[PDB]
Amino acid sequence: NKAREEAIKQLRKLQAQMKDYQRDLDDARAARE
């Protein structure tokens, strides 16, 4: 039961890491101009 908290935390981490890595390149391409 308490492992569901760790599962939800891992899911949130894996869902947020993609945006965290993509927004850097987004900022680079936006400020390129």
Place this chain on the structure above:
Amino acid sequence: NKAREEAIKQLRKLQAQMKDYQRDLDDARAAREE
């Protein structure tokens, strides 16, 4: 052990959220400057 792993898991989501916030702020700043 499961409680320790869960304690080590809430920081992963928190660190990912902080990194996403920083990168999104950088993206918003770049868009405003563009």
Place this chain on the structure above:
Amino acid sequence: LAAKKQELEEILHEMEARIEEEEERSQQLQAEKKKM
């Protein structure tokens, strides 16, 4: 199962927050369509 269902309802409210995130993302999509 009581503890499991309590945690699942917590995860459900987190999914509702994620639905709010989808709403924000749709707002951003419309803003991008109208801005560029």
Place this chain on the structure above:
Amino acid sequence: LAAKKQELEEILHEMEARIEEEEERSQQLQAEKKKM
């Protein structure tokens, strides 16, 4: 608790479809961004 689990599974499948629509919205976002 079993009926509660069934309801939670229903809304979790709802959230899965919502995440699918989220990825599709991200595809539309990147398409609008590259549309030039």
